[PDB]
Amino acid sequence: AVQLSELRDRQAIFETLVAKGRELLACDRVIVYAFDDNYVGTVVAESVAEGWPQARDQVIEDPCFREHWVEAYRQGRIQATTDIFKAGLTECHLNQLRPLKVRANLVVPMVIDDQLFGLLIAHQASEPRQWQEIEIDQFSELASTGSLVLERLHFLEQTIASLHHHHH
Numbered sequence: 001a002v003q004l005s006e007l008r009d010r011q012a013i014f015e016t017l018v019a020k021g022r023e024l025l026a027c028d029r030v031i032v033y034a035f036d037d038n039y040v041g042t043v044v045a046e047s048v049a050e051g052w053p054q055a056r057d058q059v060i061e062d063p064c065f066r067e068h069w070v071e072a073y074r075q076g077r078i079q080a081t082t083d084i085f086k087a088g089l090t091e092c093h094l095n096q097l098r099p100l101k102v103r104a105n106l107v108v109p110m111v112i113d114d115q116l117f118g119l120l121i122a123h124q125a126s127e128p129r130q131w132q133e134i135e136i137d138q139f140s141e142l143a144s145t146g147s148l149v150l151e152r153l154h155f156l157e158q159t160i161a162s163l164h165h166h167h168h
C-alpha cells in the first residue's frame with residue numbers, strides 16, 4: 001500500500017472480515033493476522049465476544065510460517081483443528097494460544113497479488129469444535145473475496161495515479 005487513505009479502506013475491510021466472520025461462525029474470536037517481510041504476524045483487526053481476552057494489536061512471532069507454510073498457504077492451504085490439545089502441537093505453540101483461551105481454530109489464507117498477505121483465523125474458546133465443510137468454504141471465500149477486493153483496490157489506485165499523471 002502507498003497509504004493516502006489506502007490504509008483507511010483497508011482497515012474497514014479487515015473489520016468487515018472479522019465481524020462477518022464471527023457472526024457467520026458464531027465462534028468466540030475472529031482475527032486478521034497480517035505478516036511483515038519476515039512473516040511475523042500482527043493482529044490488525046479482531047472481533048471477539050464479551051468475556052474473552054482481546055488479541056487486537058498483538059505481535060506474535062511464529063517461525064513455522066516462514067519455515068514451512070508460506071508457500072502452502074499461498075496456494076490456498078486451509079487448516080482446521082477440532083482440538084488444539086490433540087493435534088500434536090508442541091508446548092511453544094500452545095503457550096501462544098493459552099492466554100487467548102483457544103480450544104479450536106480455523107486458519108484460511110489471505111492472498112493478495114500472489115503474495116501471502118496474512119491469515120484469517122477463527123477461534124473457539126469454550127470447548128472443542130469440528131468445523132463443517134460448509135463453514136470452511138464460506139469462511140475461505142470470505143477471506144479470499146476480501147483479499148481480492150484489497151488487491152483490485154490497490155491496482156485501481158495505481159491506475160488512477162498513472163492516468164492523472166500522464167493526462168494531456
Ligand SMILES: *[C@H](c1[nH]c(/C=C2\NC(=O)C(CC)=C2C)c(C)c1CCC(=O)O)c1[nH]c(C[C@H]2NC(=O)C(C)=C2[C@@H](*)C)c(C)c1CCC(=O)O
Pocket residue numbers: 033041060061062063064065068069077078079089090092093096097100102105107121
Ligand atoms: C505453525 C503454526 N502456527 C500457527 C499460529 C497460530 N495459531 C493461531 O490460532 C494463531 C492466532 C493466535 C496463530 C498465530 C498455526 C495455525 C500453525 C499451523 C500451520 C499449519 O499447519 O498450516 C507452528 N508454529 C509452532 C510454534 C513453535 N515452533 C517453533 O519453532 C517455535 C519457536 C515455536 C514456539 C513459538 C508450531 C509448533 C507449529 C506447528 C508445527 C509446524 O507445522 O511447524
